[PDB]
Amino acid sequence: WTATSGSCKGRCFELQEVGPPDCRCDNLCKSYSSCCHDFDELCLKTARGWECTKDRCGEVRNEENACHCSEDCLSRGDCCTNYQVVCKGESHWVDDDCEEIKVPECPAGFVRPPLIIFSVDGFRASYMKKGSKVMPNIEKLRSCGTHAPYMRPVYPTKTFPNLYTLATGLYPESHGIVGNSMYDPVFDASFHLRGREKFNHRWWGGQPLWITATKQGVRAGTFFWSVSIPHERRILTILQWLSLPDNERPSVYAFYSEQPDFSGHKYGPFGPEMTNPLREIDKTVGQLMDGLKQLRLHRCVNVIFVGDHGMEDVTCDRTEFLSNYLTNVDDITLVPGTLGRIRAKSINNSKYDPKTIIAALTCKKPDQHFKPYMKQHLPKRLHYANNRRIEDIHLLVDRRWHVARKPLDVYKKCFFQGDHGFDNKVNSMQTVFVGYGPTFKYRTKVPPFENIELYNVMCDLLGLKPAPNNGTHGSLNHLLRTNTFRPTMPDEVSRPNYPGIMYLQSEFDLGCTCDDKVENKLEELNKRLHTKGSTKERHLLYGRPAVLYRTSYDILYHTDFESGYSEIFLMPLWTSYTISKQAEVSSIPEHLTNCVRPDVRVSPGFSQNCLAYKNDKQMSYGFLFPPYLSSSPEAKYDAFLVTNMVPMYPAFKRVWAYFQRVLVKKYASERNGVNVISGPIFDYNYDGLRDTEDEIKQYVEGSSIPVPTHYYSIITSCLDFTQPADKCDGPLSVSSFILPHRPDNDESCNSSEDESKWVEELMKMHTARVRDIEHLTGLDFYRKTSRSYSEILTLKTYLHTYESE
Numbered sequence: 001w002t003a004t005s006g007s008c009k010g011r012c013f014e015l016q017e018v019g020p021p022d023c024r025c026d027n028l029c030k031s032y033s034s035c036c037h038d039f040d041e042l043c044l045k046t047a048r049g050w051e052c053t054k055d056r057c058g059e060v061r062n063e064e065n066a067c068h069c070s071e072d073c074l075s076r077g078d079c080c081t082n083y084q085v086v087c088k089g090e091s092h093w094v095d096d097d098c099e100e101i102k103v104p105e106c107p108a109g110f111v112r113p114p115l116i117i118f119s120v121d122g123f124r125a126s127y128m129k130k131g132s133k134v135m136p137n138i139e140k141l142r143s144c145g146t147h148a149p150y151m152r153p154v155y156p157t158k159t160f161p162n163l164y165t166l167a168t169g170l171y172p173e174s175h176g177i178v179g180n181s182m183y184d185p186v187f188d189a190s191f192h193l194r195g196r197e198k199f200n201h202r203w204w205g206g207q208p209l210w211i212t213a214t215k216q217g218v219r220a221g222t223f224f225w226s227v228s229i230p231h232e233r234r235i236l237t238i239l240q241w242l243s244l245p246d247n248e249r250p251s252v253y254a255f256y257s258e259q260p261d262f263s264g265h266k267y268g269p270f271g272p273e274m275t276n277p278l279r280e281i282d283k284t285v286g287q288l289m290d291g292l293k294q295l296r297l298h299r300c301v302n303v304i305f306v307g308d309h310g311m312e313d314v315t316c317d318r319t320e321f322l323s324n325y326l327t328n329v330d331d332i333t334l335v336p337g338t339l340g341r342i343r344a345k346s347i348n349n350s351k352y353d354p355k356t357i358i359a360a361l362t363c364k365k366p367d368q369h370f371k372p373y374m375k376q377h378l379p380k381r382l383h384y385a386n387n388r389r390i391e392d393i394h395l396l397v398d399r400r401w402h403v404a405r406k407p408l409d410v411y412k413k414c415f416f417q418g419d420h421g422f423d424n425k426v427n428s429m430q431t432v433f434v435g436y437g438p439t440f441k442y443r444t445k446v447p448p449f450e451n452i453e454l455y456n457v458m459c460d461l462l463g464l465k466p467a468p469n470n471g472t473h474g475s476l477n478h479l480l481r482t483n484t485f486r487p488t489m490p491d492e493v494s495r496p497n498y499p500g501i502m503y504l505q506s507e508f509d510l511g512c513t514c515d516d517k518v519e520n521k522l523e524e525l526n527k528r529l530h531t532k533g534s535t536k537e538r539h540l541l542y543g544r545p546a547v548l549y550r551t552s553y554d555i556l557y558h559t560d561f562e563s564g565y566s567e568i569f570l571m572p573l574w575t576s577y578t579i580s581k582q583a584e585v586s587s588i589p590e591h592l593t594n595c596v597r598p599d600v601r602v603s604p605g606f607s608q609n610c611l612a613y614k615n616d617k618q619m620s621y622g623f624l625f626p627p628y629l630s631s632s633p634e635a636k637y638d639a640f641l642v643t644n645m646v647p648m649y650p651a652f653k654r655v656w657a658y659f660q661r662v663l664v665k666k667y668a669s670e671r672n673g674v675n676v677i678s679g680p681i682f683d684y685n686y687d688g689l690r691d692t693e694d695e696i697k698q699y700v701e702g703s704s705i706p707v708p709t710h711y712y713s714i715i716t717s718c719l720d721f722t723q724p725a726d727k728c729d730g731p732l733s734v735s736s737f738i739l740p741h742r743p744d745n746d747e748s749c750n751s752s753e754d755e756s757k758w759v760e761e762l763m764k765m766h767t768a769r770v771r772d773i774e775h776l777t778g779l780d781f782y783r784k785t786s787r788s789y790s791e792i793l794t795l796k797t798y799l800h801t802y803e804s805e
């Protein structure tokens with residue numbers, strides 16, 4: 001109930017929202033049917049349009065007009081944005097040659113440059129190039145400021161998840177807005193686009209920028225506009241706020257555009273109808289810039305032009321129907337469209353089984369256009385599992401397609417020609433970033449980066465300390481002229497032991513056997529120095545990783561590789577080796593097929609044993625440093641040490657073997673040598689963070705050997721590939737992966753073919769950032785290079801996407 005009987009005189013677009021049932025005059029009041037009776041009349045004036053004309057110049061102030069061309073307008077701060085151009089001989093901002101803004105040029109009384117965030121829904125990254133002829137203001141911002149060729153959204157590439165990620169620096173799984181549509185089982189409530197429940201505060205986790213600003217004494221402009229308030233009025237309101245007295249004037253502002261997303265749904269991303277919305281957005285940017293110029297704020301304000309997701313071609317006829325796969329279709333609820341989320345229609349139904357549902361949806365038709373997953377098996381790069389609002393069963397849908405429950409859903413609701421929501425690595429989902437102003441660089445292109453990084457940067461632009469978030473603070477220092485954030489390396493928590501030869505062969509009772517026999521003073525000092533760390537500079541290129549938690553581990557040196565061996569997990573945490581362009585692949589000799597050798601530096605009690613793998617009918621084992629890449633027949637024995645051994649399902653050995661035998665040598669040829677760091681990951685509670693011992697759900701039968709949920713590899717070389725990995729003078733180049741450790745290859749529909757038909761495709765799907773790996777293992781890589789830390793942070797957030805240009 002609102003007593004909508006008060007008045008909005010002298011209150012239009014008030015900065016604080018008043019408590020019901022007193023009526024409101026803020027920019028959100030319409031969305032709450034709570035505006036005072038006179039709001040439209042006083043606050044939404046439209047008389048005479050949005051632009052001065054020759055004859056309106058000098059006019060007597062008529063307070064009914066939408067904007068003014070009278071003499072006093074400037075001091076009042078309510079001119080039409082084109083006033084000085086029409087009435088005073090001035091040029092449009094877009095017609096001026098750009099000039100570097102070396103320092104803020106701001107009116108007296110401004111304590112910091114203000115920030116304006118200009119958000120555009122569905123602005124696909126390729127519109128910057130393809131629509132450049134019709135967006136002159138946006139192109140001037142792009143080419144004079146700092147820009148990226150595209151910005152990566154979060155999954156799912158929907159509007160609410162992405163806008164709230166921009167505001168908080170958080171993955172959807174952490175901020176809580178995990179879709180445009182949600183069911184929260186703890187609240188027993190639903191969140192929908194239409195309706196009231198989305199206004200409830202309990203949905204919205206983390207700490208968004210406007211709250212971070214307020215708590216630290218920076219005034220924020222009311223960010224959100226009711227949909228019916230036209231774009232022109234939003235611009236004018238912002239310009240008016242910028243004219244307020246210093247003690248009332250906000251330091252940060254938000255403008256949101258429903259376009260081009262709205263049109264893109266109807267017409268497809270490149271429909272000929274798509275030109276006009278793009279023209280209209282550019283005109284709005286022009287109005288803001290002409291407006292700032294009138295107030296002499298155009299070399300004072302930082303402007304961020306940013307999108308939430310792109311847009312792809314999608315029509316009704318490209319729909320897969322769960323009713324063509326499942327007998328029991330009325331027993332399930334589906335969240336449909338460009339992603340699938342399935343749960344039970346009724347929790348009283350004890351005959352609902354996720355396993356049988358997954359099985360009925362797995363590889364059933366030759367060209368099937370979705371793939372079912374348990375959420376914990378989704379690629380780790382999506383970070384889409386650790387939230388009770390995300391259903392256990394998920395369908396990743398092919399780009400260009402939709403999934404629905406029954407044909408009736410589609411034709412009882414072809415309408416649309418564009419949609420979005422797909423995997424965030426898809427090219428058509430990519431969006432835009434441009435930063436322009438005194439704190440940004442001048443005419444600079446930066447490489448693509450993820451939208452989770454911007455919250456940190458907007459805090460920096462405003463002198464705020466960011467709430468804890470998923471950005472890597474400092475990884476975007478290269479966008480900024482000043483205000484950079486200079487972080488320090490995390491301190492190592494555990495130092496390693498360096499064990500020598502301390503045990504005799506006969507003390508091991510592990511049930512392991514090896515055919516090693518036969519043999520000398522030359523090559524005996526030679527093998528001992530290898531075990532003392534003589535080739536370590538060849539294989540440990542960037543320092544050893546630091547262990548950022550309390551644990552007990554050893555450094556182990558060998559001719560071909562170095563490792564950090566965990567006495568708690570009974571296996572390496574990391575194994576590091578270098579494969580040069582010329583290195584040769586050999587094979588495992590026959591006398592060594594089932595060879596496993598005790599490691600005389602590590603006690604029996606801290607070792608794996610072969611008997612457990614024998615007894616475990618499902619589990620087998622593999623090696624972290626691959627025997628195929630040993631540098632000599634004598635070095636090959638090192639690769640069979642029990643301390644190089646890890647648990648592997650036979651199904652996963654098909655993947656691992658192909659990676660080690662074929663792919664490592666391939667990358668070494670293509671990249672001029674590579675450095676590889678490999679190891680296990682344990683994430684049983686699927687939160688994207690390293691498990692402690694008491695979190696491990698599975699061990700090799702009868703033993704304390706814990707089973708990894710994933711295996712990672714970090715493959716590094718020289719960005720200038722004319723130099724070999726081990727003698728690089730400049731920037732590095734990285735790609736990495738987190739492969740799920742699974743007892744079957746159900747994820748790959750073609751896995752009964754040769755590994756050369758499906759393995760590399762699986763790895764690409766599970767591409768990762770070094771930073772994803774750090775979270776999952778508690779390690780910190782690249783501790784000793786010649787590069788600056790900021791540059792290393794950038795490299796650690798890099799993702800190799802394998803999309804085309």
Ligand SMILES: *[C@@H]1O[C@H](CO)[C@@H](O[C@@H]2O[C@H](CO)[C@@H](O[C@@H]3O[C@H](CO[C@H]4O[C@H](CO)[C@@H](O)[C@H](O[C@H]5O[C@H](CO)[C@@H](O)[C@H](O)[C@@H]5O[C@H]5O[C@H](CO)[C@@H](O)[C@H](O)[C@@H]5O)[C@@H]4O)[C@@H](O)[C@H](O[C@H]4O[C@H](CO)[C@@H](O)[C@H](O)[C@@H]4O[C@H]4O[C@H](CO)[C@@H](O)[C@H](O)[C@@H]4O)[C@@H]3O)[C@H](O)[C@H]2NC(C)=O)[C@H](O)[C@H]1NC(C)=O
Nearest residue numbers: 173174175176204205206386387388468469470687688775
């Ligand atoms: C991305 O960045 C984010 C932000 O940095 C990272 O997430 C953080 O991870 C921290 C470590 O897991 C976590 O710290 C915990 O805080 C608990 C208190 O949490 C409240 O306070 C914070 C801060 O104000 C607040 O933001 C939280 O809000 C969450 O919960 C509500 C839902 O009710 C949501 O509105 C909100 O969106 C958010 O949800 C998300 O987080 C929770 C986890 O907290 C998830 O479960 C959700 O799915 C969702 O993702 C909270 O209001 C604190 O209680 C924890 O302490 C426990 O564990 C420690 C270990 O040190 C132990 O010492 C304690 O005893 C305690 O255990 C007790 O509780 C157990 C569980 O009930 C119980 O079993 C035990 O026996 C004990 O009794 C913990 O310190 C921090 O909250 C989140 N922050 C956010 C915003 O998510 C994230 O890790 C990053 N991701 C990656 C990949 O790096």
Ligand SMILES: NS(=O)(=O)c1ccc(C(=O)N2C[C@H]3CN(C(=O)c4cnc(OC5CCOCC5)c(C5CC5)c4)C[C@@H]3C2)nc1
Nearest residue numbers: 117158159160163164166167180193223224225254256261
């Ligand atoms: N495109 S789609 O997914 O089909 C789809 C679905 C619903 C809608 C829709 O009705 N709408 C109506 C729109 C009103 N709106 C907003 O006011 C808002 C504007 N800024 C925002 O973020 C910040 C602003 C500051 O800097 C960083 C980003 C947010 C955040 C969620 C809180 C919210 C966004 C709503 C989606 N639009 C598109």
Ligand SMILES: [Ca+2]
Nearest residue numbers: 683689690691
């Ligand atoms: Ca975990």
Ligand SMILES: [Cl-]
Nearest residue numbers: 158179180181
């Ligand atoms: Cl959704």
Ligand code: NA
Nearest residue numbers: 613616619620
């Ligand atoms: Na076995």
Ligand code: NA
Nearest residue numbers: 745746748751
């Ligand atoms: Na398969």
Ligand SMILES: [Zn+2]
Nearest residue numbers: 122159261265
């Ligand atoms: Zn949309």
